Design a protein around this ligand. Structure first.
Ligand SMILES: CC(CO)(CO)NC(=O)Nc1ccccc1
Ligand SMILES: CC(CO)(CO)NC(=O)Nc1ccccc1
Ligand SMILES: CC(CO)(CO)NC(=O)Nc1ccccc1
Ligand SMILES: CC(CO)(CO)NC(=O)Nc1ccccc1
Ligand SMILES: [Zn+2]
Ligand SMILES: [Zn+2]
Ligand SMILES: [Zn+2]
Ligand SMILES: [Zn+2]
Lengths: 360, 360
């Protein structure tokens, strides 16, 4: 059976499980079960299932080189699917709540969940809570007796927390650190002294790379009982490296990809985000360009946003991007080679992960 | 050492642990560590610590009748404290997010967290995420090798989910079920046909009783390794019974307790909540009174809110409250007696739980 069909069937099975449990143990009525079904579908489905399918891919890699009974192969693939869904549901939680937090309008060419007429923020916040609780319900049901349950739960928990910490880094990235204070309304930075490579890297490492690259890879190793084919330090290093690149690509697209291709109107400039474009621009600008950036960034006025974009185009950030890209290629290739020592298979899964990221 | 001082010291220790970990493993800077310290203090502290101290109380009960080395007594009490804090932090998560969801103004005589000037909703949603993630960080650190870890995590997870389901029941309680639809803005009920005892009981069972009464009791049994001194069905039954009563008391206070005593301006009437007062009123009203209720409930206009309150006073709901109270006394007493069969000690902890609830 093809991987994607297996993964999508397991979605149906897990949905059915979750909703039947709600009826049998949580006293739910049909109409609220329907609302939850529709929320699950709207918030978990319609992406490329990169995260979840990486779990499946890593597990299939190991199946090709490990002796097992057929029933065990099926069990391992079922567990990889269920694990993949845990990650997709965790993403769903974060996108729901992030869209509310940011006051976002669209996501992947549809209204943000909270914007749906019969949803509202009051319900959507809670819906996103439930989305993450469902990851744990999945795990405890499908993996109750599994030898990797402890490790899987403890890793999930660490990634989830890393992610929330990353969110805090992101939403606070246009404040001056020394001015953080719950008691005082936070002004936007005037000096942009915290728009540095090191600070950018910390935001992205936590906000995105743990759940998007580390967790899928390591959960594939966990359901495969294969964590000893790898040096975990290398898996981390490669995950953080590819995940940074992913986020740089996303930063570039927010500014330059037409909205109907992007699936939204990018607002990083108006939101004063610490984006790769801003940090790279500030690293090569002259004094006059820096002043012009400060006078126009983080402002809703479309004239000012057009001034920031022009500053970026004139600064030939495309060539800094090509150079960053090259260096990442080098380093990813290096890490793949080091991974081949202990596991050719796992190194190949990481190559596939890289290829998929490098072309989007 | 007195229980409360032990509990408050363990808060300090757990805070220090969490914030030191953020510096050592999550690359946090001092100013963001300070923001998190202040958020933890503002959102977890200043209540009566009923939930957390019930864990400690149940565990002390067992210590008085169980042979142990001193070091073991300390360990058990430390674990009860840490478990108590997990519950207090879980409450904190739910109050932060609930206050945002509801657009609330105050809570326990201070502004809701999201209303703090240097917080905002954008940060507060995430802060409440972190508050719940911290429960898991506590558990995995302090209970890593403990024999009750699995059971504790699986129970925590079930309560958390019950709670989110309860929130969904609550926020949807003034809608007609058959009209739930993400695509359609939800009108308030006109018939109030879902303002019934059975429906009220379902809201409150899930929204409050699992985290406020069930979890504290059962976590005390878990850290005591005492789950075999009880019949768990009875613990559930008593938890749900006392927790319902707690919520009825809270419903009555929202309407009738002066705001400076309440710690907020009660808005259940304007919010069209399915409160005990509304359900009891509808169960004894005549046709004209029902019509007057419908024409005035769920409306911000203070004149209409005064009309609902007058309808409640004239309906002598105080006497329905005395009658409900009596029946709960009967049933709680009955359950305490059944609990004494297997455990006098645990039955006494449940009596103390009842006494504390019955007088507030
Ligand atoms: C060293 C490496 C590979 O190039 C992997 O950590 N990343 C960077 O160089 N990131 C960076 C981010 C923002 C601005 C400038 C640089
Ligand atoms: C279309 C989009 C854009 O973010 C949103 O659904 N998804 C992806 O591009 N996912 C993806 C992630 C890593 C590597 C390859 C693909
Ligand atoms: C039976 C009992 C004890 O009295 C325990 O479940 N609860 C009730 O009677 N709850 C109730 C709630 C709202 C309105 C009317 C009744
Ligand atoms: C003052 C207040 C009012 O809700 C809010 O902090 N706390 C309590 O009354 N807690 C409590 C819970 C159960 C039994 C006894 C006390
Ligand atoms: Zn965001
Ligand atoms: Zn972006
Ligand atoms: Zn609420
Ligand atoms: Zn209330």
């Amino acid at each position: 059976m093809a991987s994607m069909e297996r993964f999508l069937s397991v979605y149906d099975e897990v949905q059915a499980f979750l909703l039947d449990q709600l009826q049998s143990k949580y006293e739910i009525d049909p109409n609220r079960a329907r609302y939850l079904r529709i929320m699950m579908d709207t918030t978990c489905l319609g992406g490329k299932y990169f995260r979840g399918m990486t779990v499946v891919n890593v597990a299939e890699g190991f199946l090709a080189v490990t002796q097992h009974d057929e029933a065990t192969k099926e069990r391992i693939l079922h567990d990889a699917c269920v694990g993949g869904w845990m990650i997709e549901f965790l993403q769903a939680h974060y996108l729901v709540e992030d869209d509310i937090m940011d006051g976002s309008v669209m996501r992947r060419g549809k209204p943000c969940w909270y914007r749906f007429p019969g949803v509202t923020t009051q319900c959507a916040i809670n819906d996103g809570i439930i989305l993450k609780s469902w990851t744990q319900i999945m795990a405890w049901h499908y993996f109750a007796d599994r030898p990797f349950l402890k490790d899987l739960l403890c890793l999930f928990q660490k990634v989830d927390y890393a992610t929330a910490v990353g969110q805090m880094y992101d939403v606070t990235s246009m404040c001056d650190s020394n001015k953080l204070d719950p008691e005082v309304a936070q002004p936007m930075t005037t000096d942009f002294a915290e728009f540095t490579p090191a600070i950018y890297k910390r935001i992205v490492k936590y906000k995105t790379t743990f759940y998007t690259y580390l967790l899928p890879l390591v959960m594939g190793l966990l359901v495969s009982e294969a964590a000893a084919s790898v040096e975990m330090n290398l898996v981390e290093r490669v995950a953080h490296l590819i995940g940074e690149y992913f986020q740089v690509q996303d930063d570039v697209m927010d500014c330059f990809t037409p909205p109907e291709q992007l699936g939204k109107v990018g607002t990083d400039i108006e939101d004063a985000k610490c984006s790769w474009l801003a940090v790279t621009f500030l690293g090569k600008a002259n004094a006059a360009q820096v002043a012009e950036f400060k006078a126009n960034y983080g402002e809703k006025d479309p004239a000012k946003v057009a001034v920031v974009k022009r500053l970026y185009s004139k600064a030939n950030l495309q060539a800094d991007f090509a150079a960053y890209e090259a260096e990442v290629v080098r380093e990813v290739e290096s890490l793949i080679e080091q991974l081949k020592v202990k596991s050719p298979t796992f190194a190949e899964s990481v190559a596939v992960v890289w290829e998929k990221t490098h072309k989007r």
